[PDB]
């Protein structure tokens, strides 16, 4: 490398050959993976070794050398932070465009995405969404780290550097074996809670809290079998081992079911969540995460929908 | 000439311990009331110790430091009885058993089903945990087995192999490779792969299928949401076959599978502490998950989605 | 019949013949007739529908089954027994098994003065010690394996009980040539100009000294170790600095090539160790007692630590 | 297919930022005006995206230039980083190099390690993970370290090993037990003990109840830990004689040895993965750790303390 060219500056495109002739281990295989002949490949990587004073590879299979194995994570990282300039590059210029990485909690996630996606898909093409699916400590974590952009959660999030948009009140509903006596019914009181043998996820999960305050409204503890997932719990109410609450946004993916049935407390009893989108107060990019705050209000009124499409009746307020 | 506790004696102060009320304990030990107070009484005047304190009932710091010994007692006379038996005792009281995420939805209706009706003495407890959990709370005694996959790489631990579970590759409904039967795993290449965190063993398999095959941000952590991600074509995602009545007949989903000459599943076991004198009992249980496993994979073939062919050996 | 439980006075008799060999000398030993024994013997033989002992003789044979068997009810009766002798003890303080966790930072320094207090003022107490980090000291907590443990406060565990013991101050350590060697007045900022060499993210000290770097850095990797005694061979080879507990000095800081250096007196560097437990437990006093353990074995650690001659932080 | 800046255009972005005129932005470069406003508006073209201002005697970059700028000197940083090193790369042990170590070896090997590192190889710049087999063997699956030390067999597919040494255990008991200095001691002494060992995670662990098994609760993290509980009375332990002069010379511990004809010892190895074409320098890197080694066991034998005999 004392033949090196001293007015040698490796390109981008000599940076991609290399490390896909690492990767690929065959000339053929790596020209066609960059849609290049074969001529082209071998001159794009003999002025990268030329200009570098430095053998690179090793031409019956492709072996990196010693030199070119020590290097190749050097031009990795190079490629990484050029295809990262290029996607923030798709974001500067507007509002909704280019990566944005969601972080969501999992009893929301999974019966907000599809709609959230779809209006995405369509009204948005140019936005990048990036999902984080995780329990809320972690997420505010990831938030403030930088990690993620934004964080779906319930509100208050008690995280002091951080600005909250409020999204919607979500009801809750009561889940039951086919066979339990409260099925179907629509007037219960907070106190038939005392009633139940609640299954709920464990103490990670926001919504074991707020079952437990409900519980706790009503004066009665909401107290061996730990679940992770509403999935699993909707399984274990299914086999007869107790009931519980979801949100009226899993309906359609989870209680419906053979072997399930549904409440909902009276009209007067107030039994949600509060749903909100979390951010860095520190953030410029407050007016962007407005606008996909009113995407996330429409995806709830469509998963909401959802819900009242499947016939389960859902809790009345007032 | 001098006291000695009986067993009876001992269940009393356990029950009671553990139930915080003595009507609920009376009843579990199908005794009286009155029958169970003579017990607790004669077992603290033998001793000379308040174990139970005066409405719930609330052990004395002396009981607390009793307890484990007193449950001690009744577990090694449990294991004495269960061994004389033998075979023909079969599985009766409290098991804790201990699930991964990606199987346990899938597994429990079927279990759950043949315990309740053909072991009706059998008192399941579920904890649903990843692996890492899983082997910790075996490792502390706080479940007695632990369904994962294999090999658990603990020593300290028994594994009892239960069976192997196929993957099917799950895609967007327009997808190029909706369903194609005949997959390499060099296929693999080609997908932009979701997976569940790092956390799940499904994960790690995923990753070792592509590494056998010469192979960041968005991360889940269900099944049922990497599943919403596949629908509104952001990636693709491999799924134990248990999984399919659950989760793959959503509407936008197709599905694929590699060859019949490639090998994509996991090897699912019951591990146990090496130490535990019940080897037969969790046999007997091993027995109980297999065949829910089969009727998992009947329900799987009931939906009429094409599953992974293999070489019957 | 299906409903037979033995009774721990019928396995008495059946450990006891095997063991003495003699139907005479067991029964004596037992202080009962030898038809009381026989009748007992007997009873779990038709209770079990298990020959354990041969019948037609004076002599004493244990069966295949009563062999096979003879183990687990010695066990039952060493079990009872157990229970027996610590019912005793059960009354009085700090007496019987206490597991005690301790988080891998204070272990090794807390131990020795821990344990010596322990062996002369209490001791009936049979001590276990656990060392893990606080998440798995926590689940062991929740699980019942151990019974109290020691770390960093807040634990941020719901159901838990915590009992504030002190506060530990941490000490700068660094290469003997570097520049801060020796110093007692550092300023937080003062962070930024080291390379600092931490434990890896399990490890709540790892979680503390970044905390300190976010006071002091206004807005805004590889090497990482297990033990802090690596930590100290990297910091002598010249690799980086780092912070430690003051306990830990006569342990990690007299080995030859470290210096350490000292924030200022207006400057709060420390973590707020504390003794924590399951709410749910009725054994708050003698926990109170544990306590006061702890908090006399820290001031003999600190005292371990001065008499270093290692000039600590001054508050 | 669609548009990818190149290093070059980028250059230009970042300097034009920088000098606030073209002119200078062109000289700092050493190019034409004309080619330094080529680049600039292919960028810009490529992109969609208006990154500079003709701005009131001077150029201002615009709201999206100055997000985006951060990032193309990333990209440049990286850019010259893949340069600098490319000079070194040819040079066998230069350059970084990580090094994954097992704790109960890591402590004791590497003051000799990198001071032989130092001396002798100090172009070579070393990285140190400290952590168990199970993690090492994953991390060097991943590519996030190049060598771990370990105990063989690592039963690892995939991996090469390089065995370095047999390093001998000792017995470690407190001063009064009645073992103590022993040199005699036949595998079935092992019964006799109250063991205290490392947790299940440590290869150390495992090796201990193998011994045990040849020869047919209390746990720690390190074995400064279980030094303290064997001092106290608690119980006897085993460990490496690399750690001898570091964690058993305080007062209330003592030593004992099993007998000449008795194998109580750990095969240590230098485990790397198999793809790899640098076998020639983990080669000499071994060298290093089989010096090192011989080190720390010569820092033992200083102590004065009787060693095992074979
Ligand atoms: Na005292």
């Not at 929301?108 to 329990?135: G, K, T």
């Not at 009113?294 to 809790?315: D, H, M, P, W, Y």
Request: charged share 20%; glycine share 6%.
């Amino acid at each position: 490398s004392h033949m090196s060219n001293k007015e040698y500056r490796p390109t981008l495109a000599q940076l991609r050959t290399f490390v896909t002739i690492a990767e690929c281990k065959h000339f053929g295989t790596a020209a066609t993976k960059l849609s290049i002949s074969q001529p082209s490949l071998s001159q794009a990587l003999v002025a990268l070794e030329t200009g570098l004073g430095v053998q690179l590879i090793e031409r019956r299979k492709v072996i990196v050398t010693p030199a070119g194995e020590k290097l190749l994570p050097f031009a990795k990282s190079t490629l990484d932070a050029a295809e990262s300039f290029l996607s923030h590059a798709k974001g500067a210029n507007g509002s909704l465009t280019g990566p944005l990485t969601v972080g969501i909690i999992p009893t929301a996630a999974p019966y907000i995405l599809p709609s959230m996606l779809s209006i995405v898909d369509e009204e948005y093409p140019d936005l990048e969404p990036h999902i984080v699916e995780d329990q809320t400590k972690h997420l505010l974590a990831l938030l403030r780290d930088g990690a993620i952009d934004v964080a779906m959660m319930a509100l208050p999030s008690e995280a002091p550097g951080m600005k909250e948009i409020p999204l919607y009140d979500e009801d809750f509903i009561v889940v039951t074996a086919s066979d339990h006596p409260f099925a179907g019914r629509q007037d219960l009181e907070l106190s038939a809670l005392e009633d139940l043998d609640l299954l709920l996820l464990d103490d990670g999960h926001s919504l074991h809290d707020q079952i437990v305050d409900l519980c706790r409204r009503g004066d009665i503890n909401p107290i061996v079998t730990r679940a992770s997932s509403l999935t699993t719990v909707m399984q274990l109410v299914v086999a007869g081992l107790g009931s519980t609450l979801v949100p009226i946004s899993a309906i359609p993916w989870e209680c419906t079911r053979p072997g399930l049935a549904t409440a909902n407390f009276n009209s007067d009893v107030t039994a949600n969540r509060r749903i909100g989108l979390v951010y860095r107060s520190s953030s410029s990019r407050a007016e962007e995460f407005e606008q996909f705050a009113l995407i996330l209000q429409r995806a709830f009124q469509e998963a909401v929908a959802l819900a009242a499409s499947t016939g389960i009746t859902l809790k009345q307020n007032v």
